[PDB]
């Protein structure tokens, strides 16, 4: 119902299930209730360095509908639902298979901040190393888990991907 | 469902949108979904001076909802419902036409701090002017919004624009 | 539709509606509506010593949900629901008649940190005598409620009083 | 160093110790080095309702400076100094002896939104009554200590007493 | 003792009096006893856009020390010191005089987030029209003041007040 | 001036530098100017799980102060001087040498909370975990820093790492 979004690859929304800078509660939404959910408290002093989500009406490589990093100015509260604009993508393999994280910034609409900010490779490398060191540590403590960190890629193959879980959900 | 409340005007329910003092994200509810979103991030570095939100089975003037600044001793977190009584209302023309804004304290069973709060001249004028000041310069940014902001007037006129608009919700 | 857990009632499912260490604001969630009221703000100084919220899908002996206080690592929205497991009830009779008020922790695939903590007498005693307190003093302000606090049981007399609110639920 | 206040006792210098709303941190100066110290978490699930400090070279009946109370719109850091006026005096006996403690608001020249309140009576009594019962509770759980709270008196009383302390530190 | 900053102006020390994003109290250091005070809190409903301080050792052309914004990932608590790189500085006139605010981001050594803001216009004009913005309203309600803002200067110009600053202390 | 503690090595003095669960601001004091300085934020999106300190008037191996991991209820805010008990420590070398991160609990008189906590196998092992993950994992985006941990050793190790650099101070 709140759909992918009109725009969908170039703006997509995005319902957010972790503020930025939160405290480690790893909330996600169930799909059968609309429920919100704690998963887990995370086991490692880390935290989400951008809000993060899904893209409704969406089915990814994994099965999941797409998971996506929002970079904001001040943290989006969970079950809030955000326009974003998709900027990059990290690649990565874990338990779950094939598990890449878009990287996305508000829509200008929404925040004219972030008007330059066009591909992922627009903003601080050692914030982007946080990214990936995030997703390869976070779960460190978690024996049954595993993340193999890829490279980044930039905003147009971030909307190929989108485009892809837009049309599996289709069929 | 929620409803303006039994006791409309003289008590009214408010779904709460915005907290008080908070960081500038203003979210704004979606009839057809239910659902929360981002409008915009505030790009002037002010915050909202009282919770803020709507009063649901309301039309105003133009054609929104009524927008009632709930003050209250704590922040009430955005998508809760809040039992409130109308203490004056601010008269101001933005870019939609007639966009008035009520002003409320707690209803007495959900805090009798404010007892003796029963018209805006009750508070305060410092705080009622940061009240005038913010809606008169935090849209200065947005070249294509404006707002000239009016007079206050007096708990019994804030009903009476609440009866109006319920009046309005029912034709 | 969230229920009470397919594992009740060795762990159940609690929605929280307020968040531990929180400043006052004593939300409550309307079984008609399915919206968060703000109940009140507590006109004492006082706050939830863990998070609070009930279990879906139970009559407990005052014809109210089951209520739960969960003990986190760190505060959960409300809103959000929480997988738990019982380790013990603080007895008490309020205004409302029996009360109690049941302690957990969040289930082991949640968080590992509580698995050693299975009765509430493993939890700090102070920490219990907090809880106490809490109850005995926090509506002293509130002239027609009163609250008389008993002693606490174990998980396996938890576990009863769940069962016997799911069963009364279920007639 | 910072002394009592030039205007003194219409207004006096306060130090703070703890901010209001705040987690039940309570800290205090010492004399000796001027460092800031945690002398206790409070074992009860108690805030302080008003920011709390002291009044620098005062020396109370007891022997320690006088504690005051600030009500202030927005918490205030420990070992900020803030410009107050007193406005009424709480009497209480506890394991200090025989104690009070000041309530003040912040000199108009610092917040004017208190610039009426001229008197305790002029703030509601719903929060007078809270301040009362956070002192007559907050160290219930510590058998070493007790606290037996009196009455309030005007501001009239508390800038006497206030006046008493400087004379005496100046002796 | 803290100095202004061995590699200034390149690089100088900004010791914090309000943290970025905060409620709106205004803390100031007082040079006689090296305390924190209340200035005041802002009547208006606005905040920092980024943390605030002062050059120590600097005399600016109205008297006090160089004022300082110190942009950050995350808010610097008052009376924290951090090594910053000026950018750029806002003219503006105001009831201090002939005012200016240095713009500044943390040294690389301490973020290299910021490390290629080389000056002002490196960073998003939406922004520095907030801070702009800030400063022609914070005070539109104290009518015994008023503040006249000018134009953005680039980094070699706040370099160049900044050493100024520093010969006039050394006089 | 304030000292290693009275009762050292059983009880010994704090001085916080980060709090608890805090934003990955990395405070430092400073022993010429006793001035809080800010060394970095990290680079990570990594917090700090205890509080965060070292013990006044000791010389550890590597030339520094003992460094404390303060585990506690709330955060402390950096600047606070709080009274623990050293229950373990873990050895690690990093780029500071031969280095070692005692754990502590506030001392009973502070909080009666963690009276029952010994040894640092008496916490979660979960938890522990945590923080040997922590210092494993928060440097890695700083290649001219490197960290290699070893194990925990218990209260009695504690004791006598702090007792030496007591003594190494003294000569």
Tied chains: 1, 2, 3, 4, 5, 6.
């Excluded at 591909?119 to 601080?124: A, G, I, K, Q, T």
Aim: hydrophobic share 40%.
């Amino acid at each position: 119902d709140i759909g992918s979004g009109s725009n969908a690859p170039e703006e997509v929304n995005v319902v957010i299930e972790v503020s930025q800078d939160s405290h480690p509660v790893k909330y996600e939404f169930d799909e059968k209730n609309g429920a919100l959910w704690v998963d887990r408290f995370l086991p490692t002093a880390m935290y989400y360095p951008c809000n993060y989500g899904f893209i409704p009406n969406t089915i990814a490589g994994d099965g999941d509908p797409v998971d996506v990093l929002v970079l904001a100015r001040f943290p989006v509260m969970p079950g809030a639902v955000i326009c974003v604009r998709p900027v990059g993508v990290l690649m990565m393999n874990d338990e779950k298979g094939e598990d890449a994280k878009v990287l996305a910034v508000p829509a200008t609409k929404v925040d004219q901040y972030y008007g330059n900010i066009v591909n992922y490779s627009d903003l601080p490398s050692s914030f982007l190393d946080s990214i990936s060191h995030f997703f390869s540590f976070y779960k460190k403590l978690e024996k049954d888990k595993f993340v193999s960190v890829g490279c980044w890629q930039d905003a147009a193959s971030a909307k190929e991907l989108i485009r892809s879980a837009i049309i599996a959900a289709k069929k």
